[PDB]
């Protein structure tokens, strides 16, 4: 039955990530079972982009990418082909002819705590929009007018990042809804991933 | 065209509160910013504060630190002004700015300005 | 301080006149973030010089100014008779923003 690969510690991480900074772990040579994250759990929102979730541990890839990132919740929609938006348009930009299936299961027991819980960041102005597949780890002062700026904050020149606020009671409509999103590589190499 | 609309005068008494909406439209509102001014019978101008619509910055005078909270909004694409506990030195006549912003560039003049709004704390 | 007083109390000459200006400042301001705007009475103030030295969207007469770091000048040749109203200086640089007086232009009769 040979050895497996870590999707519980993958999944079961205590701090994943910042949005606008997404990590990434190249899976392979070994099983997988695309089984038991579906038939039975608490993951809501499994959309399954690409191969339908039925019948998929038999299919087998080369190489599994994983993604993962912490986002509001009722902004959770814009992460698909296409769709445009303050996200999937300045820091996940997910390519069209995209394989592989998304999770995004809600949390509020290890985020959000008591009073304010400002922590994670997210891109908020930037010049113009993401090329597929790509993270912008960037600092650097935005120039949103006509003059130069150098490292000051104040009209025409702001500050790329900004804070989530996000509050103990403050709905259920923001609310911090942890993301691991997939994906999946075959080309000219005999696959490894190859799970039954 | 591109304008900015401004709400209608309102009289309160000394001990209250105020809210003045600059509905912008015409133009890109996302990228821009708010300047509030305060105008009095005649006299010389002043400065209230502003606050950028890209949310979470915030700059009033030092005089005037506490009784106004500048929020923001996004739903509706407008802007509000609220001050507290109104004196009998407050009667004046307030205004709204901000930048014909479109897209890629902003422009670096407060082009277009409020109608203007008018306060009368009286007994 | 953080002031920004203006030399001419009051001008009054017919239509013609050089119309010279000073908004003299006093704290040290790059002349990247100032402006010039004129408030005919009766309603809102009008736009007319930023960023010391360029022109607005659309202006007569080709109004003409700038200056220094703590020193700036408007300029109105042959001025035009339907212009006659209050100009105030305002500066952006850095916070406070501050106003200026204001200066006020009136015909002799």
């Known amino acids: 039955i040979t050895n497996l690969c870590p999707f519980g510690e993958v999944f079961n991480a205590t701090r994943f990530a910042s949005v606008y900074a997404w990590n990434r772990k190249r899976i392979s040579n070994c099983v997988a079972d695309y089984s038991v994250l579906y038939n039975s759990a608490s993951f809501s929102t499994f959309k399954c982009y690409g191969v339908s979730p039925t019948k998929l541990n038999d299919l087998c890839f080369t190489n599994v990418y994983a993604d993962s990132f912490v986002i509001r919740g009722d902004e959770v929609r814009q992460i698909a082909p296409g769709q445009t938006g303050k996200i999937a348009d300045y820091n996940y930009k997910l390519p069209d002819d995209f394989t592989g299936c998304v999770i995004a299961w809600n949390s509020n027991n290890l985020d959000s705590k008591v009073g304010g819980n400002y922590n994670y960041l997210y891109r908020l102005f930037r010049k113009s929009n993401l090329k597929p597949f790509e993270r912008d780890i960037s600092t650097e002062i935005y120039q949103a007018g006509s003059t130069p700026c150098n490292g000051v904050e104040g009209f025409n020149c702001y500050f790329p990042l900004q804070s989530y606020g996000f509050q103990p009671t403050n709905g259920v409509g923001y609310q911090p809804y942890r993301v691991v999103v997939l994906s999946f590589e075959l080309l000219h190499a005999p696959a490894t991933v190859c799970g039954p | 065209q591109m304008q900015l609309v401004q709400s209608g005068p309102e009289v309160k008494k000394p001990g209250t509160s105020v809210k003045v909406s600059c509905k912008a439209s015409?133009?890109?509102?996302?990228?821009?910013?708010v300047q509030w001014v305060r105008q009095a019978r005649g006299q010389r101008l002043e400065w209230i504060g502003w606050?950028?619509?890209?949310?979470?910055?915030?700059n009033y005078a030092q005089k005037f630190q506490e009784r106004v909270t500048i929020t923001r909004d996004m739903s509706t694409s407008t802007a509000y002004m609220e001050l507290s506990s109104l004196r009998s030195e407050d009667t004046a006549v307030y205004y709204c700015?901000?930048?014909?912003?479109?897209?890629?560039?902003?422009?670096?003049?407060?082009?277009?300005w409020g109608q203007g709004t008018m306060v009368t704390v009286s007994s | 301080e953080i002031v920004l007083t203006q030399s001419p109390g009051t001008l009054s000459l017919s239509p013609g006149e050089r119309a010279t200006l000073s908004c003299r400042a006093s704290?040290?301001?790059?002349?990247?973030?100032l402006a010039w705007y004129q408030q005919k009475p009766g309603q809102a103030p009008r736009l007319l010089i930023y960023?010391?030295?360029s022109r607005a969207t659309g202006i007569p007469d080709r109004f003409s100014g700038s200056g220094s770091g703590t020193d700036f000048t408007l300029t109105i040749s042959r001025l035009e008779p339907e212009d006659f109203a209050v100009y105030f200086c305002?500066?952006?640089?850095?916070?406070?923003?501050?106003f200026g007086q204001g200066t006020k232009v009136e015909i002799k009769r």
């Open positions: 700015a901000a930048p014909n912003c479109s897209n890629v560039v902003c422009y670096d003049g407060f082009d277009i």
């Open positions: 015409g133009f890109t509102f996302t990228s821009s910013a």
């Open positions: 606050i950028v619509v890209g949310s979470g910055n915030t």
């Open positions: 704290q040290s301001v790059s002349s990247s973030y």
């Open positions: 960023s010391a030295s």
């Open positions: 305002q500066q952006y640089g850095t916070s406070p923003w501050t």
